[PDB]
C-alpha cells in the first residue's frame, strides 16, 4: 500500500484483471484448494470430468444443483463491489475470471470473460441449444434439453476440456495491451489461465498479486500483497479513487 503501488494502479493505460475463486471465499463460498477447498474434499475425478459425468449424470448434477443454490443465494463481497467501482472510475478496463460464479456481475461489473463458464449456464450434450438459469433445478429428474432430449449440461469446463477458443483469444488480446493486472484469488496453477499474467510481464507490464498465500506467480510479482482481496481490494480502490480526485482538472 505503499505510493509506488497506488501509483502504478491510478497511473495505469490499461489496467484488467484476472480473478479465482479466491474472490469469492469472502461470499461465504470454500475455493478449489487449500485448507476447506472442495476438491480436498470432493474428489475433481468424479465431479469436474466429461468421463464422470457420463458415467454418473445423476452425481455430478445433484453436486452442481447444490452449488448453484449456493452461489444465487450469494452476495457479492467487498473484493467484487471494488472491482466494479475500479472499472466505474474507468481504471479497470476488462476483467477476466476463472470463477463460475456471477458476483462480479451482480457487483455491477461489465466488461467480464468468464475463462472457465458459468453455473448460470446450462447447455445440451448434443446440440447447440443452451440457456440461462434464475435458479438451481431439482435432480433427479436428469435435466433435459427441449429440443433433442438429450441430456443437458452445467455450462462449465471441466478438467481435459477446452475453453472456448473466442473466449480465450479475447481473454489474450486483453493482456496482451494490459500495462497492469490485478492477479486476486488464484492458486496459478491451472492452464491455460495461469500462464495470462505471464504475457503481461513478458510485453513489459506489471503484475499486482492479491493473495494469503504465496503461488507460483509470486517470485514474478511486482507487488504481491499478503492479505484477503476484499479488505486489500476494497483499501487499494479507496485510495486510487482519492488520488484521482486529487488531479487538478
Ligand atoms: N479471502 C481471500 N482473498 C483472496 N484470495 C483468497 C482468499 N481466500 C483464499 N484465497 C486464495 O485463493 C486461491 C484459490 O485457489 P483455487 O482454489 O485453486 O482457485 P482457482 O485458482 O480460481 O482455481 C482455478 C480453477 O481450478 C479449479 O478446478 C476451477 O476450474 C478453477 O477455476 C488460493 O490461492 C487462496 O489462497
Ligand atoms: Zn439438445
Redesign the pocket.
Known amino acids: 500500500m505503499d505510493e509506488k503501488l497506488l501509483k502504478t494502479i491510478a497511473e495505469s493505460k490499461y489496467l484488467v484483471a484476472l480473478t ?4 469469492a ?2 461470499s461465504g463460498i470454500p ?4 485448507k476447506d ?1 472442495l ?1 480436498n474434499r470432493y474428489r ?1 475425478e468424479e465431479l ?1 470430468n466429461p468421463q464422470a459425468f457420463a458415467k454418473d449424470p445423476e452425481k455430478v448434477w445433484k453436486w452442481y444443483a447444490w452449488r448453484m443454490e449456493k452461489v444465487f443465494n450469494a452476495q457479492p463481497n467487498k ?1 467484487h463491489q471494488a472491482f466494479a467501482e475500479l472499472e466505474r472510475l474507468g481504471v479497470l478496463k476488462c476483467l477476466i475470471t ?2 463460475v460464479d456471477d458476483l462480479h456481475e451482480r457487483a455491477g461489473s461489465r466488461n467480464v470473460i468468464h475463462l ?1 463458464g458459468s453455473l448460470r449456464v446450462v447447455r445440451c450434450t448434443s446440440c447447440n441449444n443452451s440457456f440461462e438459469v434464475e435458479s438451481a433445478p431439482k435432480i433427479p429428474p436428469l435435466p433435459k434439453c427441449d429440443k433433442c432430449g438429450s441430456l443437458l449440461r452445467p455450462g462449465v ?1 471441466w478438467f481435459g476440456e477446452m475453453l472456448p477458443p473466442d473466449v480465450l483469444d479475447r481473454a489474450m488480446r486483453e493482456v496482451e495491451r494490459a500495462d497492469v493486472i490485478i492477479v ?7 492452464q491455460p ?1 495461469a500462464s495470462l499474467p505471464l504475457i503481461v510481464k513478458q510485453r513489459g507490464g506489471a503484475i499486482i498479486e ?4 504465496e ?1 507460483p506467480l509470486t517470485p514474478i510479482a511486482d507487488y504481491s500483497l499478503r492479505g ?3 479488505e486489500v481490494m476494497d483499501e487499494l480502490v479507496r485510495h486510487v479513487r482519492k488520488a484521482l480526485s486529487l488531479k487538478l482538472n
Not at 475455493?31 to 487449500?34: E, I, P, V
Not at 492479491?210 to 498465500?213: A, E, G, H, V
Open positions: 479465482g475463486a479466491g474472490v471465499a469472502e475455493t478449489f484448494r487449500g477447498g476438491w475433481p469436474a473484493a476463472q470463477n472457465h469446463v486476486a484469488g488464484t492458486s496459478a496453477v491451472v489461465a492479491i493473495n494469503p498465500d503461488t484477503k482481496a476484499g
